[PDB]
Design an enzyme around this catalytic site. Structure first.
Site, PDB file in Angstrom:
ATOM      1  N   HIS B  77       1.123  -1.191  -0.011  1.00  0.00           N
ATOM      2  CA  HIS B  77       0.412   0.278  -0.018  1.00  0.00           C
ATOM      3  C   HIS B  77       0.259   1.580   0.046  1.00  0.00           C
ATOM      4  O   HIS B  77       0.377   2.259  -0.502  1.00  0.00           O
ATOM      5  CB  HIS B  77      -1.033  -0.304   0.731  1.00  0.00           C
ATOM      6  N   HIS B 244      -0.815 -12.720  -2.763  1.00  0.00           N
ATOM      7  CA  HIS B 244      -1.886 -13.838  -2.407  1.00  0.00           C
ATOM      8  C   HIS B 244      -1.287 -15.663  -2.209  1.00  0.00           C
ATOM      9  O   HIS B 244      -2.323 -15.828  -1.711  1.00  0.00           O
ATOM     10  CB  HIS B 244      -3.069 -13.224  -3.260  1.00  0.00           C
TER      11      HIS B 244
HETATM   12  C1  HEM Z   1      -5.579  -6.127  -7.955  1.00  0.00           C
HETATM   13  C2  HEM Z   1      -4.811  -6.210  -7.027  1.00  0.00           C
HETATM   14  C3  HEM Z   1      -5.211  -6.713  -5.668  1.00  0.00           C
HETATM   15  C4  HEM Z   1      -6.083  -6.125  -4.969  1.00  0.00           C
HETATM   16  C5  HEM Z   1      -7.582  -5.887  -5.467  1.00  0.00           C
HETATM   17  C6  HEM Z   1      -5.732  -6.305  -3.534  1.00  0.00           C
HETATM   18  C7  HEM Z   1      -6.910  -6.740  -2.647  1.00  0.00           C
HETATM   19  C8  HEM Z   1      -6.810  -6.923  -0.979  1.00  0.00           C
HETATM   20  C9  HEM Z   1      -7.843  -6.878   0.182  1.00  0.00           C
HETATM   21  C10 HEM Z   1      -9.086  -6.775  -0.070  1.00  0.00           C
HETATM   22  C11 HEM Z   1      -7.137  -7.813   1.107  1.00  0.00           C
HETATM   23  C12 HEM Z   1      -8.329  -7.443   2.270  1.00  0.00           C
HETATM   24  C13 HEM Z   1      -7.574  -6.205   2.996  1.00  0.00           C
HETATM   25  C14 HEM Z   1      -7.652  -7.159   4.548  1.00  0.00           C
HETATM   26  O1  HEM Z   1      -9.385  -7.395   4.455  1.00  0.00           O
HETATM   27  O2  HEM Z   1      -7.530  -6.877   5.489  1.00  0.00           O
HETATM   28  C15 HEM Z   1      -5.846  -7.561   0.345  1.00  0.00           C
HETATM   29  C16 HEM Z   1      -5.099  -8.476   1.359  1.00  0.00           C
HETATM   30  C17 HEM Z   1      -3.764  -8.368   0.804  1.00  0.00           C
HETATM   31  N1  HEM Z   1      -2.966  -7.918   0.329  1.00  0.00           N
HETATM   32 FE1  HEM Z   1      -4.061  -7.675  -2.053  1.00  0.00          FE
HETATM   33  N2  HEM Z   1      -4.967  -6.763  -3.799  1.00  0.00           N
HETATM   34  C18 HEM Z   1      -4.450  -6.520  -4.727  1.00  0.00           C
HETATM   35  C19 HEM Z   1      -2.827  -6.754  -4.615  1.00  0.00           C
HETATM   36  C20 HEM Z   1      -1.905  -7.585  -4.048  1.00  0.00           C
HETATM   37  C21 HEM Z   1      -0.289  -6.880  -4.323  1.00  0.00           C
HETATM   38  C22 HEM Z   1      -0.077  -6.218  -5.235  1.00  0.00           C
HETATM   39  C23 HEM Z   1      -0.104  -7.368  -2.981  1.00  0.00           C
HETATM   40  C24 HEM Z   1       2.268  -7.566  -2.359  1.00  0.00           C
HETATM   41  C25 HEM Z   1       2.552  -8.294  -3.604  1.00  0.00           C
HETATM   42  C26 HEM Z   1      -0.383  -7.397  -2.133  1.00  0.00           C
HETATM   43  C27 HEM Z   1      -1.009  -8.267  -1.034  1.00  0.00           C
HETATM   44  C28 HEM Z   1      -1.528  -8.641   0.069  1.00  0.00           C
HETATM   45  C29 HEM Z   1      -2.149  -9.233   1.643  1.00  0.00           C
HETATM   46  C30 HEM Z   1      -0.254 -10.238   1.928  1.00  0.00           C
HETATM   47  C31 HEM Z   1      -2.610  -9.085   1.747  1.00  0.00           C
HETATM   48  C32 HEM Z   1      -3.237 -10.002   3.273  1.00  0.00           C
HETATM   49  C33 HEM Z   1      -3.015  -9.079   4.550  1.00  0.00           C
HETATM   50  C34 HEM Z   1      -3.384  -9.720   5.598  1.00  0.00           C
HETATM   51  O3  HEM Z   1      -2.514 -10.838   6.156  1.00  0.00           O
HETATM   52  O4  HEM Z   1      -3.884  -8.940   6.594  1.00  0.00           O
HETATM   53  N3  HEM Z   1      -2.435  -7.241  -2.743  1.00  0.00           N
HETATM   54  N4  HEM Z   1      -5.979  -7.781  -0.731  1.00  0.00           N
HETATM   55  N1  NIZ Z   2      -4.040  -4.926  -1.091  1.00  0.00           N
HETATM   56  N2  NIZ Z   2      -5.506  -3.684  -1.147  1.00  0.00           N
HETATM   57  C1  NIZ Z   2      -5.900  -3.931   0.071  1.00  0.00           C
HETATM   58  O1  NIZ Z   2      -6.160  -4.414   0.759  1.00  0.00           O
HETATM   59  C2  NIZ Z   2      -7.640  -3.474   0.139  1.00  0.00           C
HETATM   60  C3  NIZ Z   2      -8.216  -2.960  -1.041  1.00  0.00           C
HETATM   61  C4  NIZ Z   2      -9.474  -2.187  -0.592  1.00  0.00           C
HETATM   62  N3  NIZ Z   2     -10.298  -2.715   0.159  1.00  0.00           N
HETATM   63  C5  NIZ Z   2      -9.867  -2.661   1.502  1.00  0.00           C
HETATM   64  C6  NIZ Z   2      -7.970  -3.163   1.682  1.00  0.00           C
END
Ligand code: HEM
Ligand code: NIZ
Ligand code: HEM
Ligand code: NIZ
Ligand code: NIZ
Ligand code: NIZ
Ligand code: CL
Ligand code: CL
Ligand code: NA
Ligand code: NA
Lengths: 713, 713
Positions: B77, B244
């Protein structure tokens, strides 16, 4: 573009502390305006301004062939925004040329007046500020028309961006009282710190209160607003009758002919506004206020015809060509000249607010005396005009040039000249050790010096430790100053001073003003030693002691600190949150957000709180100068909650046990809440910061101690 | 309190040029973050971070006992706000800790993440910035969970107030497209410079476009927003699938249980927000996005399970406990662990946006190759993560510490090392005389150097004269660069260079990059001589020439200056007024308002306008360095009006005769209209200011020529 102010319209605004940076200032960082001014050929400037008075420009033709009245109104408006409550407003920073003042309705067509002065400003360049020029121009106008002024001082340095001033909460220009953001409540009580009856006016509404043309009621508003500008009844009558001896108002046609104010005009208007579609838009067809009054039979010469008219006729309510209420002399001959057509004459006219000077009973007595003795009138107007136009300049040490009057005026909070050798560094060391040997504590020494120095406000440059007015009425009895504790500290320091001064030769002596500050320095040094740090706090002597007879007690009342977050003090319950009041005080002290942060965190642990409150005293080594406020504030092992007794006081408890560790106010906890302030707290709460914290604290302490020291500028 | 932006909500805001003053910065003006970082024991910080990963705090318990996923999301982020259009956003200033980003909905509960890092930040103090720490923490999370990173560079200095960035015009968080301030028009065309689909999101909506759960349509938004963050298809798949692989989302209950964001919370929250009334409010009960998805069977270890799941099951649309759309694997066993309860397992789940990786045809081919060749996926994700997290850091010269990767990447716009003696002052004098003897004019020399240097933007530190990229595709063909004129200048300079370099020994040579800049300096010196002033312009050698193969032509497209008020250039008709674009460009150049003013006024008289337009060329001695722009602009003898043909061009006519004297654009005339700008123009248009003007112009010229010179930092 959506901004942080849009999303969080109640978050605290710190940008107000960070105006006036060297980034926005085009002059070098070494530029010293006083030195430039001191070489200005002021006599040559005044000759050019004298020639200007009768050199009409066709884009804004001069009424009666003479711009004098226009420029006197320009200078009067430049000064007339001043409020005694906070010292903000006034002519001292040339702020008429910036938003929002450049576009206030009451400033309509003063954009033309300023533009007339460009050629002269361009000729003399940096050696005369706009701020000084506006005032000088009003003096030259008066002189050119036969009126002897009391004097003029230069030294108003120009500013380069708008000040952040609270002018009121209304969202509509000139809104009448009683709306959703009413500046009036109760029995027509104007909210502090405001000094005008409607948003965008200077003092009052020239038609009468909320447009009601009752001179008696208008007089109440005049009296109230002028008092909030530091003017009494005599001064007020002198000023209004004096101003309205000259010139005319402009209301030749309907106001709906007038276009956008300067800040809303198109780019092509090149910083001018109020462009008018009525006839030629200027000159004989001008529309400014919408009123159409010419007070005297010689609008371009000083006379006593304002009072001869006011008392020599009876007055009838009438309407100008724009529809505004104004008054005309019953039965009179056409004796007033026309501004452009020498074969037309008019009857005498008056504003509602002019007639206040006759129909209010206290004004009437003064106006009658001035009518019968125009030499008394002239002298009162000259003195008042000087005061009006210099009230925010500060100590006499800042006054520059060859026309500074030699008479010392009470309103200047004057400080006697020093006429003896000053203490040197070895004497200062000796005094600090005697203060520390007397038994005065760190907390008492810090608290007393902070009380004396922190009355300074950079808005009008009043207050500060010079003069030792903390020992006088009314400072000595202010609740924030802890009168009983203060009296005991002062008696100990006075005995130290008497013993030092009695042992000298050469005529060397120390003032009590210097010794209060020096004793505060000793206190800070001792606090640093208590924490294991050896520092010297810088000290500059040269302050003098003012007498009670040189101190106007009533005028001093506005300097009473009713909110002082640096001492965790609030005199009562206010509508403005206390953190907002902190930032406001910080701005008056001239402090940045980092300076405010370090200063506050240090003062808490030195014991500067009023009443020895433990609120925000987050240390187990009080009276030692450490960064403990920040380290403890930021400790996530503590959880904070508002108390049941009071939503404005918070308890910090151990998160794991529930044990009570600390209490704090909104002023203490804002440093762990506001995202910009918490980033500053983190720097001073880090493990590498104890030395930085000490050094930065000493530097800010010294800055506050010196804020009024224009004798060293 | 009503402010100037309330009364005149369309006036130009200059405060954006005057951010980041030394007033708001707590560090000395002598503080040099690179030097502090160079002394950090980076290995010790990494050990502490590794320890933190599994040190769960009760106020925000770690999922699976390991904060790695939370921290990866935090770093992602921090980086993910970046926009290639203007270089604004990104991780490089640590702005996640300030408004508005600290309170964006997509950043929910990252306030907890940052607060977990406070003890480490406190321990190491100024020797590691927040900005560096956020990225390093993401690196260490990946390493702790079994993934070897490509490397890390320090050197992101902290900032101390919020940046002024245009994030969009919506007045409602997360507003769906087609509102009154829609960021979309036409066929789902996102407005420049935005790079997110809704206000407060990072890139896209995880439920699908405007919340519609169509993975194919979602893929279009993913592709567009990632491209606007400088990522291609391979990098995009690698990043989303790599991220993810770890962790989980949080949506245990309805979102209406979640309270105020940090900037709206009460002072007792001490900088945290989103407090939840759902059960314990945390851990197993956490609510962040409202989705309830855990992607892999080992969320705390690097695996190939993301793609095994994505391809190995069929997916059915379902809803989280908060009502959000998400997908579950049809017919699967409960194989996914629970974050807190070892006796619970769950079925595989996916976001709409994860399914995009399979159902978009171009992503599917990549995803398949990564599934079949996991070493290629790993290497792609490591390179992409490095890029993501360093894309805004600028030239490699700014990269600090012992983990900087040695491989040079194309996206870094690399510049070859200089491996030969540089020209000295005698050589510089000789080259300038040759340039001047060649017949090149002031206008050509100035224009070519301006074109070369003014591509720099401080937002991501891309651009500038180093590399001589002005000679390469695509800069050599930009219309603003005047391709035909440029080619003739460059051929003359290349012949000068070849003759100089062929006469040397000892391996000394001059690069073309240095000679472009040096020839621009000669033109400025010549212009000053044309006006009778003897001026030497400072020059620093050491630039090198990049090749075409070191210059990604597609990535260079965003530096094309479609609006450059300094050359009175506008490529098309835009909805944003041209003076707003001028200030935007000044901000990217790092200029204050006085610097912008002096620079523009001088460029106009030197002949730097595109196409030799006479707009704003208010002088009769073109190619002489004088303050004529200011003196003529401010002359009240001229009246201005918009032309009938074009509302954006203005004619300046003699007030008395009507004769046409000049024409100007909005960019020109703003300096005579905006009240702060006009106050600056007045300083340079004064009779005492000609030498000041020349000297300030030279200083600002030199500043722009050196903007990218991090090799001399
Ligand atoms: C289309 C792009 C992406 C979308 C829409 C997206 C969406 C999200 C959402 C909604 C969450 C949940 C937030 C929560 O409720 O705690 C999340 C978690 C996460 N995303 Fe993404 N994500 C994106 C790309 C990325 C990228 C590029 C990375 C890192 C390289 C990333 C790494 C993470 C990680 C590690 C979590 C887990 C958080 C946790 O364990 O607390 N994401 N993602
Ligand atoms: N990794 N992207 C996010 O955590 C996110 C995107 C949309 N709504 C809440 C969290
Ligand atoms: C109750 C206080 C006051 C009221 C309501 C007030 C009101 C006004 C109004 C409405 C105008 C006409 C503006 C226009 O149409 O051009 C004006 C003109 C003027 N006022 Fe005042 N005034 C006040 C006090 C003062 C003071 C204290 C001075 C200076 C000592 C001053 C000096 C002038 C002058 C010289 C003009 C004439 C301008 C010209 O000739 O263009 N007034 N006044
Ligand atoms: N001296 N005061 C004024 O010119 C004024 C007062 C109220 N409305 C317009 C102008
Ligand atoms: N609005 N203006 C003030 O608060 C101020 C001005 C100059 N120095 C200190 C405070
Ligand atoms: N919004 N941030 C910027 O535009 C910027 C940051 C650093 N140097 C120049 C410009
Ligand atoms: Cl002010
Ligand atoms: Cl930014
Ligand atoms: Na003031
Ligand atoms: Na950036």
């Amino acid at each position: 573009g959506t901004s942080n102010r849009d999303w969080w319209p109640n978050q605290l605004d710190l940008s107000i502390l960070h105006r006036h940076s060297s980034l926005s200032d085009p002059m070098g960082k070494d530029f010293n305006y006083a030195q430039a001014f001191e070489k200005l050929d002021l006599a040559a400037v005044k000759r050019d301004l004298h020639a200007l008075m009768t050199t009409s420009q066709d884009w804004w033709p001069a009424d009666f062939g003479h711009y004098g009245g226009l420029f006197i109104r320009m200078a009067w408006h430049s000064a007339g925004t001043y409020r005694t409550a906070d010292g903000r407003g006034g002519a001292g920073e040339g702020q008429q040329r910036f938003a929002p003042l450049n576009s206030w309705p009451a400033n309509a067509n003063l954009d033309k007046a300023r533009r007339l002065l460009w050629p002269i400003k361009q000729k003399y360049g940096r050696a005369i500020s706009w701020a000084d020029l506006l005032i000088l121009t009003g003096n030259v106008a008066l002189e050119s028309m036969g009126f002897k002024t009391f004097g003029f001082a230069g030294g108003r340095a120009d500013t380069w961006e708008p000040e952040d001033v609270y002018w009121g909460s209304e969202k509509i220009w000139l809104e009448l009282s009683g709306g959703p953001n009413s500046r009036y409540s109760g029995d027509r009580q104007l909210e502090n710190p405001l000094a005008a009856v409607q948003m965008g006016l200077i003092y009052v509404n020239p038609e009468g209160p909320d447009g009601n043309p009752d001179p008696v009621a208008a007089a109440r508003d005049i009296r109230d607003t002028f008092a909030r500008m530091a003017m009494n009844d005599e001064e007020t009558v002198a000023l209004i009758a004096g101003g309205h001896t000259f010139g005319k108002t402009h209301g030749a046609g309907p106001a709906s002919n007038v276009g956008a104010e300067p800040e809303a005009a198109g780019i092509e208007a090149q910083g001018l506004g109020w462009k008018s579609a009525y006839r030629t838009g200027k000159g004989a067809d001008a529309i400014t206020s919408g009123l159409e009054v010419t007070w005297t039979t010689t609008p371009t010469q000083w006379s006593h015809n304002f009072f001869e008219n006011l008392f020599g006729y009876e007055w009838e309510l009438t309407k100008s060509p724009a529809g505004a209420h104004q008054w005309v002399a019953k039965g009179a001959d056409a004796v007033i000249p026309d501004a452009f057509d020498p074969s037309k004459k008019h009857r005498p006219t008056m504003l509602t607010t002019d007639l206040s000077l006759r129909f209010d009973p206290a004004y009437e007595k003064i106006s009658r005396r001035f009518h019968e003795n125009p030499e008394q009138f002239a002298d009162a107007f000259a003195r008042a005009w000087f005061k009006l136009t210099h009230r925010d300049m500060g100590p006499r040490a800042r006054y520059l040039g060859p026309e500074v009057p030699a008479e010392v005026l009470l309103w200047q909070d004057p400080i006697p000249a020093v006429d003896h050798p000053l203490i040197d560094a070895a004497d200062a060391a000796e005094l600090k050790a005697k203060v520390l040997a007397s038994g005065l504590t760190v907390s008492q020494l810090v608290s007393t010096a902070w009380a004396a120095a922190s009355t300074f406000r950079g808005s009008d440059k009043r207050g500060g430790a010079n003069g030792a007015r903390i020992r006088l009425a009314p400072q000595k009895d202010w609740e924030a100053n802890q009168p009983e504790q203060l009296a005991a500290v002062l008696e100990t320091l006075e005995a130290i001073r008497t013993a030092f001064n009695g042992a000298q030769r050469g005529g060397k002596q120390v003032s009590l003003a210097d010794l209060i500050v020096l004793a505060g320095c000793a206190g800070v040094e001792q606090a640093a030693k208590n924490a294991g740090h050896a520092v010297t706090v810088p000290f500059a002597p040269g302050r003098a002691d003012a007498s009670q007879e040189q101190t106007d007690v009533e005028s001093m009342a506005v300097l009473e600190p009713v909110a002082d977050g640096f001492r965790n003090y609030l005199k009562g319950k206010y509508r403005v949150p206390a953190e907002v009041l902190l930032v406001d005080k910080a701005q008056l002290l001239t402090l940045s957000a980092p300076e405010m942060t370090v200063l506050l965190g240090g003062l808490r642990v030195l014991g500067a709180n009023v009443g020895q409150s433990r609120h925000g005293v987050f240390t187990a080594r009080e009276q030692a100068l450490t960064n403990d406020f920040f380290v403890n504030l930021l400790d996530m092992g503590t959880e904070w909650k508002p108390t049941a007794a009071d939503a404005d006081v918070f308890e910090g408890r151990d998160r794991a046990t529930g044990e009570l560790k600390w209490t704090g106010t909104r002023v203490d906890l804002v440093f762990g809440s506001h995202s910009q302030l918490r980033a500053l707290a983190e720097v001073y709460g880090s493990a590498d910061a104890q030395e930085k914290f000490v050094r930065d604290f000493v530097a800010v302490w010294n800055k506050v101690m010196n804020l009024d020291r224009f004798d060293l500028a």
